[PDB]
Amino acid sequence: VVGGDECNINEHPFLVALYTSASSTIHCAGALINREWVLTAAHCDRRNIRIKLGMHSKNIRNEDEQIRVPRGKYFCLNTKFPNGLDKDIMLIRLRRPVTYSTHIAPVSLPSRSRGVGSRCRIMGWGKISTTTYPDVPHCTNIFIVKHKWCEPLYPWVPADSRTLCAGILKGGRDTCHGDSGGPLICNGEMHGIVAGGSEPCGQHLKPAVYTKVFDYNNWIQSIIAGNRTVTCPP
Ligand SMILES: *[C@@H]1O[C@H](CO)[C@@H](O)[C@H](O)[C@H]1NC(C)=O
């Protein structure tokens, strides 16, 4: 995250970091939905995903940190594009559940749709400068803007797609490499999943794309409920 500061240590209990059995590098983040499920971006998938929960500083371990691996991964199968990036969302079922604590808690799903003008918050362990990664997660506030700003910039984001275009039109604040899959929080609810923006991040007139979670509530609830035939919203 660029243009922000270290997040409050208690404001991201649902934030998980994603890496692999091969690299300790945090290539994405995700959001804890309940004791056994994490929501993240589909492009964040890797062969041997590893998930760190309850973490803030990468060098100063929180007492309640937990490490988990997937037992199941679910995607949208009805996508406009074959790589599935127009519906960049994925559910990960943890091999073993986690217990809630101060630093490990579920995020609430959106109870209603929020649009242009809404002030939201982004967070992650992604780059904070051109070539620098933070030791702690950084946070900042951005706004949901007209979807037209993202369309000409991102080929995988068609008009009327289930995504929110958000950031700071003037530039300076934005999600960056390593932040994808993380949650976009608006009024205490997760309204988005970081899909991606431009490189370098924070450029003037270049907001980023966030998968609109509200549209996927039914799919998410169904999947967690045990349904394995339900499909994502058209
Ligand atoms: C999955 O959800 C679909 C759509 O709701 C519906 O047909 C049924 O409720 C579920 N299938 C199963 C096996 O429960």
Cβ-Cβ contacts under 8 Å for 89 (sequence gap 6 or more): 39, 40, 41, 42, 75, 76, 193, 211, 213, 216, 232
**What sign does the CA torsion over 202, 137, 133, 177 have?**
negative
| Fold that domain 1-12+107-214 belongs to in CATH | Thrombin, subunit H (2.40.10)
Residue 54 structure tokens: 């309850």
Mutation choice for ligand 1 from 74, 227, 228, 232, CB with most ligand atoms inside 8 A: 227
Which residues make beta-bridge pairs with 232? none
| DSSP state at residue 223 | H
Q: Whose CA is nearest to atom 3 of ligand 1?
A: 230
Other C-beta atoms within 10 Å of 10: how many?
10
CATH entry, 13-106+215-227, from 3.40.1080.10, 1.20.58.220, 2.40.10.10, 3.40.50.880: 2.40.10.10
Residue 118 structure tokens: 């809404």
Pocket of ligand 1 (CB under 6 A): 222, 227, 229-230
Q: Say if CB 38 and CB 55 are below 8 A apart.
A: no
DSSP strand pairing (37-40 vs 28-34): antiparallel
Distance between alpha carbon 51 and the CA centroid of its chain, in Å? Answer: 13
Cβ-Cβ contacts under 8 Å for 152 (sequence gap 6 or more): none
Cβ-Cβ contacts under 8 Å for 132 (sequence gap 6 or more): none
**What sign does the CA torsion over 122, 125, 128, 129 have?**
negative
Ligand 1 centroid distance, CA of 230 (Å) = 6
Which residues make beta-bridge pairs with 38? 32, 92
**Spatial CA neighbour of 165 closest among 142, 183, 146:** 146
Q: Where in the chain is the domain with CATH 2.40.10.10?
A: 1-12+107-214, 13-106+215-227
| DSSP state at residue 80 | S
Method: X-ray
Q: Say if CB 46 and CB 198 are below 8 A apart.
A: no
The Cβ-side half-sphere exposure at 139, using a 13 Å CA radius, reads 14
Distance, in Å, from the CA atom of 128 to the CA atom of 5, rounded to the nearest integer, reads: 9
**Spatial CA neighbour of 14 closest among 152, 188, 133:** 188
Three-state DSSP at 210 gives strand
Tell me the residue type at 42. A
Q: Which residues are catalytic?
A: 43, 88, 180
Q: What is the CA radius of gyration of the chain?
A: 16
Three-state DSSP at 132 gives strand
